[model samples]
Target: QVQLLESGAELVKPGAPVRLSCKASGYTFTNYWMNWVKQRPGRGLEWIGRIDPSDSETHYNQNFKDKATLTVDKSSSTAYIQLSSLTSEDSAVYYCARSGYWGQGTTLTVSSAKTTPPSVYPLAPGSSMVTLGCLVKGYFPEPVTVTWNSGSLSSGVHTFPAVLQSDLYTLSSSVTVPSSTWPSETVTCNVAHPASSTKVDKKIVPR
Candidate 1:
């Protein structure tokens, strides 16, 4: 399973439009939904919305539909949220999330919006408390198979699915890491494509 940490930053001129991006790594980029939300500086958090990277279908928080636009790209596993008509009141934090939930948050300021950026995850031998999604690239009308090697995780805490459109198909899966001693263990993501070959393995880490 490829694990991705959340990240983003943006700059907005007074009364101008502001845009930011969150990049992801650790797995087949396409086939999963990435989401974004707004966080006013030093205030409470609220749901901004989610998006299907493959199709660009988004569900927004009714209150923000007039102020924000959210988008995603499967190829890069990245999501973007743009806010318009910026003002000092628009200053706050933003976030990019995956697997149907907010993963991590980033801050945005109207004048020079900035936040503590996170580093991209490095490939590792294994990881713990992590779940993954699967994908079948270059294959049409065929389903990919997944097999688990071993782990101390509960089944219900993870979800995996495949999204198909036109002649392209991709898979998505996720697992939640218990907030205990998860930093230790070997977490692996396996994917079996239609054209038989060595199963692909993606190393993951839970934030």
Candidate 2:
């Protein structure tokens, strides 16, 4: 029943500093260690640090020792981090967690990166079936989730694991439907970023 809420400045500039806060509720604030995690676009999660609210003791990732400072405000039931020397490489989403539970997340963008929308198309019509493919190419980083939705609801959809390209990840999914459903059925492909909660979608109705 514990809940963590993280908040921080969204738009930050290079060479500047950013302070992030995590507010806790539904539990005794001093009973558990509050940890901070960082996730870059399409990248795996990285542990930043943690704070023991009871004694104000702290622990941090050696990699971030000089880059991040962890602190706490026991009176307010909150944990915080001050990140210094912002840069494009620092642009990412940050989260707070207690035990195994995590907060929704807060994003800190240093430099904007362009997002390429995914391309979706249907394969050549079969005698009584059709296959649709979703393509997201030349995207930086890795690991994007692709979901398939038929018409308005999700059903009988199969998704393949992502295959890595030179600099981006290539992902695909296939949905087979009866030719009779062609004119009446619509398919939508959604590529979602779990950390950022950003998503792109494309839909088509086979004729």
Candidate 3:
């Protein structure tokens, strides 16, 4: 009964870097080699590389030899892969597999837009709450994902999906809190590309 879990940044900016993770359980994780696989939409599979968990030794496809780095944490039964210098060409769905079991795949989105830092604005004049928006504009080969985080206050947040504008995209999220409470909260907007492995976190503290 072996099970694997994969996670990582779903959105990335062109030329940025990203990392993916795979966690294994219900079996002796180090007994077998783990491999990473990449699949692009409407395309066949591509083998990224493999890692020997026992000693953390690794090997990669000649195509990815200089683009990816692999590592493992035996104590946590987890494997990690770091891909750098990303672009829309790197966007794909990735998976980690070993023996006969494999982790659920994760999608990576890479875009060509310049990532702008997130900003906070009052929804209306004299309003008691604020809206957080991160502008991701420019030509992107694929769609992007925007997420919001406020420590323990994520549940009270309302997020708005990205809106396409000709060749660009815009996204925002809002949380209703007493204006007086703004100083005590730290909000972060995590922007990502859904077709490549990339993400950026923008933080703002309302004064």
Top model by lDDT, which number?
2
lDDT (0-100) at residue 148 of candidate 1? 35
At residue 37, what lDDT does model 3 achieve?
Answer: 95
Least accurate stretch of 10 residues (summed lDDT) in model 2?
116-125
Residues 1-207 of candidate 1: C-alpha lDDT, one tens digit per residue: 455554433445578886677777765556777766566744787787878776788899898877889876666667777788888777766667667444555545465332221112223224324334333344332334554334434463343455645535555555555435334655555555422233466556543
- Report lDDT (Cα) of residue 36, candidate 1: 67
Off by over 4 Å in 3: 112-207
Clashing pairs in 1: 1-188, 1-189, 2-26, 109-113, 127-187, 132-173, 133-173
Q: What does the lDDT read for residue 95 in candidate 1? A: 67
Which residue window of length 10 is worst by lDDT in model 3? 118-127
lDDT of 3 by residue, 83-120 (tens): 99997788898889998887878777786554433322
Model 1 misplaced stretches (Cα beyond 4 Å):
1-8, 100-104, 112-207
Report lDDT per candidate: 0.56, 0.72, 0.71
Return the TM-score for candidate 2, rounded to 2 decimals.
0.56
TM-score of each: 0.47, 0.56, 0.56
